[PDB]
């Protein structure tokens, strides 16, 4: 198997 | 033999469908449930953009075996897999399908797919991990070019042909399609931001990061051309056989935990070839965490022998920042690495530097007298700027692991600094809140230190430490030192 790994988001506000 | 369509899906899964009472997600961390009420060629929507409905491809394109490792995967899940495979895929374009079953509990998981038409079982006698298990299955490949899948994946319309066009175009390119999301909970098939792509912190956990603005204007301008990435996203691309070869395959001292995608990434770019993304490929794919991974935390152990066998032959000087983001990994044992060192003398490879340069700038690397670095964090939330400029309050909001607000410095001046503003006892009362101002060199307001095994920070020169307990109310403040949970921070890399 793969490593676990996290849904793709990221931050929702922006910098 | 059996055509895919004659298989018996529902005896297949058969005594495996989860009994009333027991958990859906422990086999394998989704709902099991759901996916055992899909079909194994259920429909899921187009997700390419609709210049890739335009695009023909020569019939004499390279096959390709196609390479699954597993290990106690739901049935479901590995069927549908294989079936979106023979589905979706020109039957010439596949070779094989070459099932490596890393010694799962029942071997009938897979030995009972290995009547479908072209699927090969190779099943390993101990757990070997999915690096090992590549290399047995791609030893074991009759074509020209291996396409690597994960076991909880679908593949969707045309996805094969785009890959294969580019590395029978040119062999050093890696390439890998856009992962679609699969949803965990209720299994739907959905497409993700197209402005996200594979990264990594100096943690060397993958992570996924934003597009800065100016690849998000390139993006723009042509949606389908070919991404370059830094770092394989997911278990899934596609190399020309000779080249994965030559290039030293995968490491075979690596265990079976983390590291898949490191090692190969930075070897590919330091030693000539590229990693890319191609939009009009699209497979989802079973996303298993909700989180990133807690670091402090297990896992930075866990994933040690893999991430230093990567780090100890690649990184040059710049492993001390993984070591810094990672201590606990800096005594594990991780076997002689003399072999890969003497590959990369073999293969005349550029140094990390290069690849940090040329191939992933966006990687924010500490300076040269910073004393700590990366974010300060407090259980799950992170020092923020909350978009405050000078004379602004700071505030304290959810780790994103996205930089921006979020990213900070102790600089050699003992300032905390973000950009060219840094944090500010404006008023010494306990209670009151700091501000940003701009830094000063001189400035004995905007100086601070790490105490307490770097597990909080006190005001140079003062009993004051920065406190949270204030943020509901307007900002952090600072507060006489005392036993509070409020007033624990600690940076994620401590140089
Ligand atoms: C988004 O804005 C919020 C505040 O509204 C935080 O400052 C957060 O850190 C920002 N995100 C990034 C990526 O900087």
Same mark, same amino acid.
């Given at each position: ?15 | ?14 005594? /495996? ?60 899940? @590995?069927?549908? /897999? &294989? ?32 009547? %479908? ?58 390439? #890998? ?8 909970? $209720? ?68 265990? &079976?935990?983390?590291?898949? $995608? ?44 893999? /991430? ?23 005594? &594990? ?13 073999? @293969? ?27 974010? @300060? ?66 400035? #004995? ?5 790490? %105490? ?44």
């Amino acid at each position: 198997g793969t490593t676990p790994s996290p849904v793709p988001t990221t931050s929702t506000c922006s910098a | 033999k059996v055509r895919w369509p004659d298989f018996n899906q529902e005896a297949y899964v058969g005594g /495996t469908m989860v009994r009333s009472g027991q958990d859906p997600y422990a086999r394998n961390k989704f709902n099991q449930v759901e996916s055992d009420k899909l079909r194994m060629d259920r429909a899921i929507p187009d997700t390419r953009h609709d210049q890739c409905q335009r695009k023909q491809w020569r019939v004499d394109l390279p096959a390709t075996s196609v390479v699954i490792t597993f290990h106690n995967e739901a049935r479901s899940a @590995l069927l549908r /897999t &294989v079936v979106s495979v023979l589905k979706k895929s020109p039957p010439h374009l596949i070779k094989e399908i070459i099932l490596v079953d890393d010694y799962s509990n029942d071997p009938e998981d897979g030995a009972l797919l290995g009547k %479908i038409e072209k699927v090969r079982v190779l099943r390993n006698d101990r757990r070997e991990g999915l690096m090992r298990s590549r290399v047995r299955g791609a030893d074991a490949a009759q074509a020209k070019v291996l396409t690597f899948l994960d076991s909880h994946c679908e593949c969707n319309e045309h996805w094969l042909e785009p890959l294969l066009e580019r590395v029978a175009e040119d062999r050093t390119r890696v390439v #890998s399609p856009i992962i679609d999301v699969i949803n965990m909970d $209720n299994f739907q098939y959905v497409g993700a931001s197209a402005d996200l792509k594979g990264g990594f912190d100096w943690n060397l956990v993958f992570k996924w990061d934003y597009m800065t603005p100016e690849q998000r204007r390139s993006r723009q301008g042509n949606p389908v051309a070919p991404i370059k990435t830094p770092m394989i996203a997911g278990g899934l691309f596609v190399m020309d056989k000779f080249y994965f070869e030559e290039l030293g395959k995968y490491d075979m001292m690596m265990d &079976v935990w983390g590291g898949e $995608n490191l090692e190969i990434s930075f070897r590919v770019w330091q030693c000539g070839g590229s990693l890319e993304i191609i939009p009009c490929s699209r497979v989802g794919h079973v996303f298993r965490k909700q989180h990133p991974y807690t670091f402090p935390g297990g896992s930075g152990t866990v994933f040690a022998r893999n /991430t230093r066998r990567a780090a100890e032959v690649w990184m040059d000087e710049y492993k001390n920042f993984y070591y810094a983001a990672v201590p606990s990994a800096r005594n &594990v044992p991780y076997g002689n690495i003399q072999s890969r060192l003497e590959l990369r003398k073999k @293969l005349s490879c550029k140094p990390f530097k290069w690849y940090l340069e040329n191939v992933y700038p966006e990687l924010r690397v500490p300076d040269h007298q910073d004393i700590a670095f990366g974010a @300060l964090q407090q259980g799950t939330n992170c020092l923020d700027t909350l978009g405050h400029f000078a004379d602004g309050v700071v505030g304290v909001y959810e780790c994103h692991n996205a930089g921006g607000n979020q990213e900070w410095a102790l600089t050699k001046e003992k300032s905390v600094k973000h950009m060219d503003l840094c944090l500010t006892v404006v008023d010494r009362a306990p209670g009151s809140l700091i501000k940003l101002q701009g830094c000063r060199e001189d400035d #004995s307001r905007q100086k601070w230190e790490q %105490i307490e095994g770097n597990s909080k920070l006190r005001h140079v020169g003062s009993n004051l430490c920065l406190d949270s307990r204030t943020a509901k109310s307007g900002g952090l403040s600072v507060e006489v030192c005392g036993p509070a949970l409020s007033q624990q921070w600690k940076f994620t890399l401590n140089l």
